[PDB]
Design a protein around this ligand. Structure first.
Ligand SMILES: CO[C@]1(C(=O)O)C[C@H](O)[C@@H](NC(C)=O)[C@H]([C@H](O)[C@H](O)CO)O1
Ligand SMILES: CO[C@]1(C(=O)O)C[C@H](O)[C@@H](NC(C)=O)[C@H]([C@H](O)[C@H](O)CO)O1
Ligand code: NA
Length: 163
């Protein structure tokens, strides 16, 4: 199709700005990570339905990181964005997406990293103001597609309803 470039394999890349990276993860874990190497170490984790509060180990930027996570949703998977602002600091959790299709998306745009949050089929976009936003290198750990920002409405549709 002429709307969705891909699919592409898991890879390390520095995407251009104004492009949504539509991610299609399979199992629970780290979906994607990215950093400006300065003041933003950002990642998205996926959690299966019905997970009571527990510590889990995630491989973030080549080290084991223990995070306290939960998914109280009985039916929906949970994407959590994870952020630390210093290389030696702690990750905090933001912009949860409760999802049935299990699709996620990320974009570098005007000073920010954009992702989706809320509850499908009514998910919206959210953002993280990021120093040198355009330089952020990403590693996707799952298959992904590329869709232009001018076609954002269709990306939102996919987040909410699936492919
Ligand atoms: C500072 O707030 C947060 C965070 O890290 O962003 C919010 C998050 O909802 C919470 N997670 C749970 C399951 O309660 C978490 C842990 O309580 C804390 O990190 C202990 O490690 O604290
Ligand atoms: C400082 O304000 C903002 C920002 O980055 O511009 C506003 C933004 O709406 C908010 N996004 C979400 C999804 O929570 C974000 C994060 O809480 C923070 O960046 C985590 O470090 O904070
Ligand atoms: Na999010």
């Amino acid at each position: 199709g002429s709307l969705l470039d891909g699919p592409y394999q898991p890879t390390t890349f520095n995407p251009p700005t104004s492009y949504w990276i539509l991610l299609a993860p399979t199992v629970e874990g780290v979906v994607i990570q990215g950093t400006n190497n300065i003041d933003r170490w950002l990642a998205t984790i996926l959690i299966e339905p019905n997970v009571q509060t527990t510590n889990r180990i995630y491989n973030l930027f080549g080290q084991q990181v223990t995070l306290s996570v939960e998914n109280t949703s009985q039916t929906q998977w949970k994407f959590i964005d994870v952020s630390k602002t210093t290389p030696t600091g702690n990750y905090t959790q933001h912009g949860s997406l409760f999802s049935t299709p299990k699709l996620y998306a990320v974009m570098k745009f005007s000073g920010r990293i954009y992702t989706y949050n809320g509850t499908t089929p009514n998910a919206t976009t959210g953002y993280y103001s990021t120093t040198n936003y355009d330089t952020v290198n990403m590693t996707s750990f799952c298959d992904f597609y590329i869709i232009p920002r001018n076609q954002e409405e269709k990306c939102t549709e996919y987040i909410n309803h699936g492919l």
